[PDB]
Symmetry: D2
Subunit: 407 residues, 4 copies
């Protein structure tokens, strides 16, 4: 109620240098709310805290005959929603940034007017969280526990059991892990990656995870394996930077361990099984031999081990199907169907090889029938590959992958 006239004052408080209290209070009265209040705030925010159309037209006015840089400025200014300043001003409150981030979070949960009140959140987050203001910190058994526990929490890909499991892939000098931290938040990371230093390229995530694995000297390691990336902040969805993390990490590895020559990933590739469902539909208009269709009716039974021959016959038609998925199949906007593909590829990586039944975990079995792939991050091939994809519609794939071309 009053917590909606407060803001009005946050914008009027010119060179006061006191609004911090305003910002503060507004942020705490927000701390407490209900799904029917937190919603009536994100509305009257867009319903009243937008661009003052009066001054804007007055501007499009002057512009009709004044197309000189000074006008485009007055225009660009009037065009700015008032809820943008409000945010900047709200940022002054103690830890106000984090509070504003969790706020854009409660928004993203929930009309089309909101899509507008969000773009502003994004516009500010895209600068406040400019990668130039983020420091890459190494995460290991040493880093404080209250933040380490958040790692267990945010592990999206290969969910981390409990603390002994966490230690397992964080303690050995066999392993290593890095996260991005912003000075304001600082106790909670933005994104992180887990790496495995090894003497080869894994095919099964199981290899990399089993404690019964054999540890190798950190420096006797020839290749680095990014086996799991994770975004921790949800209210930063869109303000992407994992795209950096890799580029950075690979380089800091170069320095510290010049013995590393390869930089791969043991990625997941979900929404592949989803695809398969679309293909099995005769209405797919997708080519399938009555014999093929008759072999994929095997996926509908959650059993692969039984009759190794069973999986064997599945493998025979899955990989090429996948290769096909990857190398060609695009979405209606013409992009690689898989979400993590658009990632590694959008970062100039290369589809190195397919790993049939790499996971075997329940999630991946349902996400994409156990499949897993390795993406490669070659030194020179990166801006070139990023081009093949970007504007053309090409996917950087190795001959081993292309090979399965038609089968």
């Amino acid at each position: 109620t009053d917590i909606e006239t407060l803001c009005e004052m946050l914008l009027s408080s010119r060179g006061e240098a006191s609004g911090m209290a305003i910002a503060a209070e507004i942020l705490d009265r927000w701390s407490r709310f209900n799904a029917a209040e937190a919603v009536q705030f994100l509305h009257m925010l867009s319903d009243r805290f937008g661009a003052e159309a009066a001054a804007l037209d007055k501007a499009i006015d002057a512009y009709r005959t004044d197309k000189s840089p000074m006008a485009v400025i007055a225009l660009h200014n009037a065009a700015e929603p008032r809820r943008q300043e409000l945010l900047r001003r709200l940022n002054l409150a103690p830890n106000g940034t984090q509070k504003l981030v969790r706020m854009r979070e409660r928004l993203l949960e929930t009309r089309a007017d909101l899509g507008a009140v969000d773009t502003d959140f994004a516009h500010l987050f895209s600068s406040w969280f400019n990668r130039g203001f983020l420091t890459l910190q190494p995460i290991d058994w040493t880093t404080p526990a209250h933040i380490l526990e958040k790692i267990i929490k945010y592990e999206a890909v290969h969910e981390i059991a409990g603390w002994e499991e966490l230690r397992r892939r964080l303690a050995p000098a066999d392993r290593r892990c890095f996260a991005f931290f912003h000075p304001r938040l600082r106790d909670d990371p933005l994104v992180f990656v887990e790496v495995a230093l090894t003497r080869s390229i894994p095919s099964a995530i199981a290899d990399v995870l089993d404690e019964s694995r054999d540890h190798i000297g950190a420096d006797t390691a020839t290749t680095a394996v990014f086996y799991s990336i994770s975004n921790c902040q949800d209210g930063l969805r869109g303000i992407s930077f994992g795209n950096f993390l890799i580029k950075q990490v690979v380089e800091d590895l170069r320095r510290d361990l010049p013995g590393l020559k390869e930089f791969v990933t043991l990625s997941p590739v979900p929404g592949f099984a989803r695809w398969i469902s679309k293909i099995r539909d005769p209405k797919s208009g997708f080519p399938l031999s009555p014999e093929d269709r008759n072999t994929l009716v095997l996926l509908d039974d959650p059993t692969w081990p039984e009759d190794k021959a069973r999986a064997d016959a599945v493998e025979r038609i899955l990989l090429p199907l996948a290769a096909r998925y990857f190398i060609t199949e695009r979405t209606p906007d013409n992009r690689p169907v898989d979400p993590v593909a658009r990632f590694h590829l959008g970062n100039g990586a290369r589809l190195e090889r397919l790993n049939f039944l790499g996971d075997r975990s329940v999630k991946a079995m349902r996400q994409a029938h156990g499949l897993m792939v390795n993406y490669l991050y070659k030194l020179e091939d990166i801006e070139t590959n990023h081009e093949a994809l970007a504007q053309r519609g090409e996917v950087a794939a190795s001959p081993a992958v292309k090979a399965l071309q038609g089968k």
Copy 2:
């Protein structure tokens, strides 16, 4: 030459996450330049890196009939100069922020098209250097020397001799000093203030500075005296925050030393002598008794000590003249004539008293014939005072000051 097509690529390098090299190089090829190059860069920046008018009209187009929030967005977007992204993207270069700050500096040194290429620098600096991202650090004999030396350098008001002088007002627990630091720069402060903890309110800066002064127990101190504020970053001219520093400091003093009851300033007030020149001009249209005019002909002689009576007779007509200066005289835009007045007053302070011949230093003798004033920062009186001034045209002055009203 090529260092002007590079940028063009910095904007095309979408989800590449490699432009850092672009940013870098562009920033170093900039490192080296000439006043005839550094100028041909700040031009072709505004001459080509502005808003693409084609898409902007296409937008004012759709807006003529679409006044729904989603349109104002597309408008506000098209209205944005391309040199804005360029900056954000340039920020990625190692220490890119500092490099971009020293850049806006080389701009400010130097047509009206530049006034437009600067507003953008400002728009980004006003968010990047949002006070929420600045930490108040205490500065004393402990803080590292490479940064301490910058303090000697940037002391604007009461210029600091050499290191022994610096130590003098930095070493005693009699003294204290705070600065604002931004995480990126971090080794060079943005603004700082020097404080003197005491048992009274000074009138002469000389009192506060002489080593022969008598030191008092830090906690036996009753009042805090801000005797000198200074902005270190020139390329941040306009992105004001000293206005905060005080508000903060006073509070951290409250905590650490609850014995402090007053919070004053031993300020300078320049451009007062400048004013006096304007008044002595008969064409001023300003009231002056032939007797007054005949007493101010004493200022033209750089000697005050000689014949204490001389200064005495000057004092008699200067203070009230000053009181007048302060309490009423406004500029053509209707604001307090003095620059540091617009500061302390714009921060809800109060003109407590005038100090005739407080300085005696060459700068202040020429800046405002040795005068100096004390501004007060009372607890409750601050948002009220800030209002008296803000929208009305009133100046918070104590009865002791008002007293000189008419004389």
Copy 3:
């Protein structure tokens, strides 16, 4: 083999400033060993690296007629075992201190000649780990995990389950914990204590531990409860300092939370059941009514809950028996029978009250049939109490405890 002539060189390497390598190597060749080697080292250490009796007699010689301070020096010197320098010199090896500490550990595991080679370890540890060189660090959910895990490991009294349990008594601002750290070791603490801030004095450890407990505002806390102290370093057995930790902690609590008025402990008191066994033996020569003896035959059945009346009748004769244990029963050297008693009492604490069935845990049930006591750390009463005990044979007990005097 050669790893026993190396040392010989460590003592000959005067102003070489190179023996670090000697120290190093000797410490690594030690790293690897066997119970039949690590023992043949701790022998030839005392069997050859002791005081050179030749020079010592030559000294007791000169002393027979020279009793001037300069002689007592030459004497005190000759009297010094060579294995003392060896240790000092061994300390130079990288992390050599920690390595020498784990070494005194392998000694303590294992004739009477060793009791001599140990005193030297002690003489050096008592100075190297002089409390003046130890810093009290606060331990909580923030402190790094690799060290936090050691806390779970070394919890001697109320063994800590797993990480969720650890968090439980480390996370709330309801709780708090401090440890002593020496600069060399630094990643592993020496001793630590767990405290519970509350509004009363606990009787059952169960109260303090159950998560279902009710948390109170840290500052709304009236009393502090030391519920568990633990020494982490075994090779520092004897170089006692937990005796400090308390004295320190209580004081830092005073500062940070002036609301704390009491400082108690919910201590264990083991070897009490052990005592009881000694009393039930008719040969004890200890007074016991045929009726008493007939009620303590109830302890031999591991069931207390069953027939609350059972425990009730046990309680009736246990507390006074205990009060007796405490207030009078001394050992053959005339000291309080309980080991943790000699602790809190030797630190001028006061036996405040007895807690029948405070623990109920298997260890305490066997250690001292569930009993638990609260010791008090009153401000003035401490050096006085420490005297009552020290040289006299008195135990600081409250009237509530004394009360059970004879029953």
Copy 4:
């Protein structure tokens, strides 16, 4: 007065864990004193706080027939002065170590009974300041100023003018400097060295110091030059470790700049002129041609420049005289006459070459008529050289030095 019975209590306060207050007070009542009090403390310290001869004889008693390790212990114990514990116990006082160090300082300023009360100070300082507990910290323009200023203060060899001078040899990446710090003191270093990274070996300190010098890329540096070592703590006189500092530094340079191949020193060598005085005395019994004696009468005139021929003729007989000084001349205890020689040589360095008129400064002109030498720290030649000297009486000198053998 009472401040001499306090200590008596510091020794009686067994497991009190409260004596810190005793230690404290005793240390402050000491803080204040007079040369006639501070002396009456260092006396009644040795006059009453020494070994209790009663128990000592009781020990030499048991030893007459008991020569088993357990006896030598009781002996070594009784032989220990009580003022030794007192110190250990005094160390508990806040910053008690530093306070005890400045104390041994006031002692060293001032009978032969004191020589005994000091050995104990030394015995404890030699362990407390065991090199294993000292960390080598790099000192440069970054390190805090309150400690940097102490560097200006303690520069013994080439006295450092003021802060601009200090900066001069501390700021360039041309230069570098390291100091040893003990955790307790920590704000004041123990010993430090100044190094110059270069492309050759200097002969004149003047080369290394002049700002007009030409700076070279830190890594384009081929050799490291230790041009000045300094001990800061006087109360640690005897607890030598500069002997380490070099050994350490050279190694950390190896790592950071593998381009460094040589490690020399541009040392001073005082008490050389002193020697010369001894030789010019006919009573020296030292060979001197009437022609020699007649050329050294030139030193008595403080002018070298005048008639370059003058210095030229001095040079001709000085270097060989020096070579002689160095290579042979020993003291009555048979050691190298120069004090800094006994240093670099005692650290296995090599006399590489002599620098006639290297200094020219007033101190060196009087210390040793401008002469200066370079000592070499070759990799393998160090423990060998340290042996040549140690037990034999040989000095590691290069053929260039030996060459001047007889002239």
